[PDB]
Amino acid sequence: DRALPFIGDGLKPVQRRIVYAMSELGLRTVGDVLGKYHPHGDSACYEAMVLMAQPFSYRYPLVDGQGNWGAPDDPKSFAAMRYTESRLSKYSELLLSELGQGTADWVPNFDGTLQEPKMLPARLPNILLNGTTGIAVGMATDIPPHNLREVAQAAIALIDQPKTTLDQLLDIVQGPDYPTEAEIITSRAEIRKIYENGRGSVRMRAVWKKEDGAVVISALPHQVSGARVLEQIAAQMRNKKLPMVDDLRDESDHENPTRLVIVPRSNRVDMDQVMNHLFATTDLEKSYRINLNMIGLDGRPAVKNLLEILSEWLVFRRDTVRRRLNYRLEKVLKRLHILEGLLVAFLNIDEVIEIIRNEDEPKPALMSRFGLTETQAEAILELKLRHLAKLEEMKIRGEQSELEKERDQLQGILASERKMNNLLKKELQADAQAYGDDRRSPLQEREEAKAMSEHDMLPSEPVTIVLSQMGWVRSAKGFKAAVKGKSNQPVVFVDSTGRSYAIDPITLPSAREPLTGKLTLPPGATVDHMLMESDDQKLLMASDAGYGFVCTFNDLVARNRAGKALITLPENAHVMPPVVIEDASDMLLAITQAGRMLMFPVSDLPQLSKGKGNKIINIPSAEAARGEDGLAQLYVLPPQSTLTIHVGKRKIKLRPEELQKVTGERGRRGTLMRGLQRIDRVEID
Amino acid sequence: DRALPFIGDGLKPVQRRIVYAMSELGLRTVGDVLGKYHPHGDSACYEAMVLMAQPFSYRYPLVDGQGNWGAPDDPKSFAAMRYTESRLSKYSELLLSELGQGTADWVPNFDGTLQEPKMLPARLPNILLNGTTGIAVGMATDIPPHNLREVAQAAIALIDQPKTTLDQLLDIVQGPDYPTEAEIITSRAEIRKIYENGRGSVRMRAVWKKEDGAVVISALPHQVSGARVLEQIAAQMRNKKLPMVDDLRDESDHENPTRLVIVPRSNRVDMDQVMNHLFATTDLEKSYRINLNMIGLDGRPAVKNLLEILSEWLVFRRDTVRRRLNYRLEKVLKRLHILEGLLVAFLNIDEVIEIIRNEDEPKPALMSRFGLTETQAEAILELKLRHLAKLEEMKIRGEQSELEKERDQLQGILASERKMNNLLKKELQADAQAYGDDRRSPLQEREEAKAMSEHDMLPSEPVTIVLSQMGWVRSAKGFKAAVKGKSNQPVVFVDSTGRSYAIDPITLPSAREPLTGKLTLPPGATVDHMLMESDDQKLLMASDAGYGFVCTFNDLVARNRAGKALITLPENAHVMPPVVIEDASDMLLAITQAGRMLMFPVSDLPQLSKGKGNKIINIPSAEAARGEDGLAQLYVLPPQSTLTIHVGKRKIKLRPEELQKVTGERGRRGTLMRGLQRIDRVEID
């Protein structure tokens, strides 16, 4: 319930018992088997058992489950289930193979009848491979499952070099590997902060596609049912939200395990926008808490690192192996001890018999001379005379010669940090190849999900907006002014006083209404320009007085009928045709009524939101008012391009080489160019 | 069903199986136990099992039965009965005690799964003790049960002297001893013919008493139910037979197991007569066939003698014992053989080891020298070095010394016909005292039962019959003539012509009828004498002509009205007052009208049935007719007694000394006595 797992085998006391109970060393129903090491009807055992029997619970199941095992986390009697129906999985061999080899400490059964292992001799770090379970909340720990092969290789790298940094390990260990083909979307940089602190969170997202018209979800985030997300998307439609979604059906089979169809209203629904709202508001994308809290080899609870986890596990695996070999060693050293004592009798029979014959207590007397032990002397006393035959001795010298070969073998490995390391790698490598499998949850960073407002759910379909000289607005479909875009984004106009206005294209009639009868305008003011670009689009606002500023399209969006005091016009000044900045690296070009040119990078004129703005090109105030001099042309254009300036029938050509000659500091009056007045047009080559 | 028993243990193959199945060596229900050595649902096993469970079936039951075990010889499933409910009786120990001691031959189980004994090591001759069973008819054998102690003593007498005659054995063995207190009534002389021929019959009778008025039967003949005899006596009453029996009731309890009351009509019913009719016509007395047919030690069927049976059994008991001892002997000789071989190693270790060490196959080489066996040498090879210690040797010499003592012991008994005989007696004696019991069926010879005729069932009560001078008959109760007796026996009269007549006292009126109006008499003939004695009573008939004869009262019984021509009277002769002969040894006394006396033993005058008879005393025919001389007095009287002969007032006395003087041959005229005429009376002193 609240217990942490062990670092050695990655099991809580309950799981360990369930696994051990089913091992070869559980030597008639299922209750019979579990009841042997578990209290009858015990609740925690029940839940832990049920969990183990289902797929998508463990990344590497310890049991092959077969049947229903009880509707949910409510009851199903283990007395109704045959012992046959539960089987330990091949993966389990990792935990149990080495049990009879002096590799675990043994403590009493739940009721003092039997004995059970304190720990299990896991060959691979199950702690990481399987981690914790249930993904509830208010757990004391949260360990994600990892890929066996990644971790294996990562443990191997650490045997070869303990000073292996985390970065090197994260070039092997990608991150959690969940029993689902849904993606882990969190940054690899963020997936690193987790493994340095042993704590954080990881996010997943359902895998989807567009199947002509509708959307098909094929893979779902770890432990979220089709029913769950399909329920949320349905509540969003039941509410006057998600109006773009027409139908929703669950077409899951056995051909397609998790096929969910989301049918949009029409053909021109931006389903990426929809999908990006759903990941933000449904479990089609989900956070998973990570807290690598566990019990260490020092028997203390501690949240630890990927490094720390893998190191400390290594010292446990080493210890486990030390034991495994020694278990054989002790068993071989003993027989050699015995064989020697027997061999002492063969060479000294006349003497050994004579002492057996002539003295009171033969044994103590036999270990005195010969220098034997109270166990060699015993073996000598138990010798049948038939064992004293030549042929019998040759059997003994043989067995002895093998067992001294084997003894050196084991002792050599047990005396070498290098030989022992070669051994562990080879086992780790073989186990990786034997019990391993490919990655399931791929790491794919994705465009972060964002919810939309009830505003940007509305229709949205291609429209061309037209304002003509007559002062009338005509919103068309798919002469003075024409602009591009969707139907939900607004259309801006700017008046001859320096005010911006927003109108919705939904309010304007078709290609078959006066603008003055839509906007509250200052006395006499004419509507000069019209704009329609992305909300965040960069713009250059300016006045023919020579002042201006950079701003975003948003800073022009004034929805209220009065308008917004945007750019302030000096005496008798007019608003310049606004420039759409299409790259911060572009150049600004200023041309004056007298024929002076200045150029500077547009990322050099301050960004404001309203006001007179700063100087762009110097023209005396008095001279501007009288319409004498003043700013006539203003362009933001790609760097190092060529222009043809039209002055009537004349086409004065300007290459980047002549433009490098008018490049200067902002606010300067700029260099004068001969006969460059009354410019009719400026084209960009 | 039709198999004979074995002489050794007195069992048929079925019984043997039932007993063995329940022995210690039947190692969960009752069917489970018997089904182990018997075919399932087998019929003969079923009957034989049921039989064994009831008392009064066996004289020495082999099983203590507890429960109903199936109404009659119909079914009761042995699968419904717990193993507990059947137990082998203490008596059985006689048959089973010696089974694991090489005392039986072993042949396969009914189905080849197990092994069972061919015979059982019976210590006492169960063949006689229990015999056969069921007492059906058309059996191939019939062996009565006998008393254990009688037979035991009888077997013992035969060990002491095989030439013991049958007569000596029949002074120990009384005869059959049945599980009932009813009597064996057959003659001991007849009980001997049976035991010499091995075949014959024995008769039994119910034990009874008179309980003021009625009769109480307490013990019944072997295997006859109260219900059976009580049914027969009831059919006799239902029929116009047994009219003297009034009521009949079965007052059996648990205070009185077999109490049956037979109530007579009155007080004066001769219930001995009744009882003596019932033994003759009901099973209150019964014959039992004896046919001592059995299987001998030569495996052949043969009916044999009490002698033969007991002898042949003795040779089986001897054989059984020979085995029992030898079984121990072989087991002791072997250990001694082994002990010796071991002892050979202790004294020759240096040598034995050196050969074990230096040669290819030690064993064959070790039996070569030392002169050992392929089993001693084995025991030496199996010796642990620790067995070679001093202390171990002293254990071996000890065990050896005891086992040589024991060996001589057994071998001494096995080498002596005398020592062996002492052994068997002692066992037989102890078993007799241990498993024995007193006799149940006593031998009591009794008055052989005889049925009565519908005639002698009639009333019968004391009556005095009176015929007076007037010629009238008056049958009284409880003057010229008075006679004694019962009322069913007839009354005889004899006329003056020599004819006898029978009349029934039931036809004559009381003490308040003329005889001529009852009998057809010759013209003028007077009725002279009247007699009434037992039917078979001896009588002396004679005529005053001097002729006569001896006859039985029956020879006077003529029931037809005409009469019977009994004694022929010479011219003018008269019939003498008939003499009741009360002892064949008595003397006849003849006195003549002239005064001549003759005497001779009455068993000296020929016995006839009718006619003139032979001479008694010589008197010339002519002189008799003329009434001159003639036979005047005739007496049959006790030998050597004294008489006073009355001649008026004179009383002439005659002692045996004067009568020895008139003793003579019959037919002689006899010796003349002075003044002995007109005798008025003859009294006997």
- With beta carbons less than 8 A apart as the criterion, state whether A217 and A259 touch: yes
Tokens describing residue A164? 């292996």
Nearest to B357 among A362, A381, A388 (CB): A388
One-letter amino acid of B675: G
Which chain A residues are within 8 Å of B383, Cβ to Cβ?
A: 384-385
Residue type at position A642:
T
Q: Which residues of A touch B345 (CB under 8 A)?
A: 385
Q: In this structure, what token pair is assigned to residue A169?
A: 């390990």
Distance of CA B64 to the CA centre of its chain: 29
Contact residues on chain A for B352, CB-CB shorter than 8 A: 385
Whether the CB-CB separation of A174 and A443 falls below 8 Å is answered with yes
Q: Phi and psi for A308 in degrees, rounded to 5?
A: -55, -45
SS3 state of residue B231: helix
Distance of CA A327 to the CA centre of its chain: 44
| Separation in Å, CA of A3 to nearest CA in chain B | 53
Q: Is A368 exposed, middle or buried (0-12, 13-18, 19+ CB in 10 A)?
A: exposed
Shortest Cα distance, chain A CAs vs residue B401, angstroms? 22
Radius of gyration of chain B from Cα atoms? 42
- Option in B350, B356, B386 nearest A388 (CB): B356
Sole residue written with tokens 């003044």: B675
A350 close to B (CB below 8 A): yes
Helix (H, G, I), strand (E, B) or coil at B387: helix
Is the CB of B365 inside 8 Å of chain A's CB atoms?
no
Strand-pair category, B63-65 with A650-654: unpaired
Residues B350 and A187: their CA atoms lie apart, in Å, by 88
**Residue carrying structure tokens 């007839």:** B490
Radius of gyration of chain A, Cα coordinates, nearest whole angstrom: 42
Measured between alpha carbons, how far is A130 from A142 in angstroms, rounded to an integer?
Answer: 11
In this complex, the residue of B350, B381, B383 whose CB is nearest that of residue A350 is B350
The reply to whether B302 touches chain A by the CB within 8 Å rule is: no
Contacting residues of A for B357, CB less than 8 Å apart: 349, 388-390
SS3 B558: coil
Q: Which of B349, B381, B382 sits opposite A353 (nearest CB)?
A: B349
B-chain residues near A388 (CB < 8 A): 353, 356-357
Helix, strand, coil percentages, rounded to 5, for chain A: 30, 20, 45
Q: What is the CA angle B254-B256-B257, rounded to 5?
A: 70
B382 chain-A contacts, CB cut-off 8 A: 384-386
Distance CA A81, CA A67 (A): 9
Cβ of B143 under 8 Å from any chain A Cβ?
Answer: no
Cβ separation A382–B381 shorter than 8 A? no
Lateral strand order in the sheet of A260-264: A207-211, A214-219, A260-264, A245-250
Q: Do residues A375 and A442 touch, judged by C-beta distance below 8 A?
A: no
Integer Cα distance of B80 and B73 in angstroms: 17
How would you class B277 by CB atoms within 10 Å of its CB: exposed for 0-12, middle for 13-18, buried for 19 or more? Answer: buried
**HEC per residue, A192-208:** HHHHHHCEEEEEEECEE
Q: Does any CB of chain A come closer than 8 Å to the CB of residue B353?
A: yes
Q: What number of CA atoms fall less than 13 Å from residue A351's CA on the CB side?
A: 11
The reply to whether residue B386 touches residue A362, judged by beta carbons under 8 angstroms, is yes
Q: What is the dihedral of CA A166, A172, A176, A181, to 10 degrees?
A: 160
Nearest chain A residue (CA) to B377: A386
DSSP letter at A575 equals B
CA–CA separation, B522 and B502 (whole Å) = 16
**Of B629, B527, B634, B616, the residue nearest B578 (C-alpha):** B634
Contact of B485 with chain A, judged by CB distance below 8 Å, is answered with no
Nearest to B191 by CA among B172, B222, B170, B169: B170
* Interface contact A388, partner B, CB < 8 A: yes
DSSP lists the bridge partners of residue B293 as: B303
Q: Are strands B671-672 and B596-601 parallel, antiparallel or unpaired?
A: antiparallel
Segments of A284-378 assigned E as strands = 285-291, 293-295, 301-303
- How far apart, in whole angstroms, are the C-alpha atoms of residue B298 and residue B295? 8
Which residues in chain B have their CB less than 8 angstroms from residue A353's CB? 349-350, 353, 385, 388
Which has the closest alpha carbon to A590: A579, A529, A646, A656?
A579
The whole-angstrom distance between residue B529's C-alpha and the CA centroid of its chain comes to 48
Taking the C-alpha atoms of residue A129 and residue A133, their distance in angstroms, rounded to an integer, is 12
Residue with tokens 């203490």: B90
Candidates B489, B480, B490, B482; CA nearest to B464 is B482
A349 touches chain B (CB under 8 A): yes
| Closest in B345, B353, B384 to A384, CB measured | B384
Chain-chain contact of A357 with B388 (C-beta, under 8 angstroms): yes
Angle at A670 between CA A664 and CA A672, to 5 degrees: 130
Phi, psi of B298 (to 5 degrees): -85, 5
Tell whether B388 lies on the interface with A, counting CB pairs under 8 A.
Answer: yes
User: How far apart are alpha carbons A619 and A598 in whole angstroms?
Assistant: 12
Place of tokens 């149990």: A96
Q: Where are the domains of chain A?
A: 1-121, 122-303, 304-443, 463-685
- Secondary structure of B140-153 as H, E, C letters: CCECCCECHHHHHH
Chain B nearest-CA residue for A390: B357
**Coil, strand, or helix at residue A362?**
helix
Q: Which residue of B has its CA nearest to A361?
A: B389
Q: How far apart are CA B640 and CA B657, in angstroms?
A: 8
Closest CA to B511 of B489, B486, B533, B478: B478
The whole-angstrom distance between A11's CA and the closest CA on chain B is 50
Mutation target for A interface from B350, B385, B392: give the one with most A CBs within 10 A.
B385
User: What is the torsional sign of CA B272, B277, B283, B288?
Assistant: positive
Chain B residues with CB inside 8 Å of A356's CB?
A: 385-386, 388-389
For chain A, helix (H) and strand (E) counts, in that order, are: 18, 31
Catalytic residue among B20, B46, B58, B83: B83
3-state SS assignment for residue A30 = helix
In angstroms, the CA A150 to CA A400 distance is 44
Residue B545: which residues within 8 A CB-CB, separation 6 or more?
A: B569, B570, B573, B619, B621, B624, B630, B631
Measure the CA–CA gap between B85 and B79, rounded to whole angstroms: 12
Which of A385, A386, A390 to probe by mutation at the B interface, max B CB count within 10 Å? A385
Count of residues for chain A?
685
| DSSP character string of B389-417 | SHHHHHHHHHHHHHHHHHHHHHHHHHH-H
CA–CA distance, A4 with A15 (Å, rounded to integer)? 11
Do the Cβ atoms of B545 and B630 come closer than 8 Å? yes
Write out chain B residues lying below 8 Å of A380, CB-based. 385
Q: Do A362 and B390 touch (CB under 8 A)?
A: no
Are B385 and A358 in contact (CB < 8 Å)? no
Residues in chain A closer than 8 A to B384 (CB atoms): 381-385
Q: Which regions of B571-677 does DSSP assign to beta strands (E)?
A: 579-580, 587-592, 596-601, 614-615, 631-637, 643-647, 650-654, 671-672
Choice among A46, A58, A60, A83 that is catalytic: A83
Contact residues, B window 627-646, toward A, CB-based 8 Å cutoff: none
Does the CB of B380 have a partner CB in chain A at under 8 Å? yes
Distance of CA A537 to the CA centre of its chain: 32
The C-alpha torsion from A270 through A274 and A276 to A280, rounded to 10°, is 160
Q: Does the distance separating the beta carbons of B386 and A384 come in below 8 Å?
A: no
Residue B271 near residue B131 (C-beta atoms within 8 A): no
- Given resolution (angstroms): 3.0
Contact check, Cβ <8 Å, B357/A384: no
Cβ-in-10-Å burial (0-12, 13-18, 19+) of B586 comes to: buried
- Mapped onto helix, strand or coil, the DSSP state of residue B621 is helix
Residue A378's closest chain B neighbor by CA?
B386
Length of chain B: 685
DSSP three-state, residue B157: helix
Task: Return the amino acid letter for A268.
Answer: R
Size of interface A-B (CB pairs under 8 A): 58
- The answer, for A386 touching chain B at a CB cutoff of 8 Å, is yes
- d(CA B526, CA B495) in angstroms, rounded, equals 6
SS3 B98: coil
For residue A492, what are the β-bridge partners? A502, A531
Residue whose entry in the numeric block shows the structure tokens 């979307």: A185
**Interstrand relation of B115-117 and B183-184 (parallel, antiparallel or unpaired):** unpaired
H or E segment to which residue A314 belongs: helix A306-347
- C-alpha to C-alpha distances, A153 to A125, A156, A304, nearest whole angstrom: 12, 5, 20
Domain B304-443 fold? Topoisomerase; domain 3 (1.10.268)
Active site residue A83: yes
- DSSP designation for B3: P
Residue closest to B17 by CA, chosen among B43, B41, B45, B42: B45
Residue showing tokens 């084997």 = A406
Report residue A206: phi and psi, to 5°.
-55, 145
Extended beta strands in A299-453, E state: 301-303
Please indicate the experimental technique that yielded this structure.
Answer: X-ray
∠ CA(B445), CA(B447), CA(B453), 5° rounding?
Answer: 150
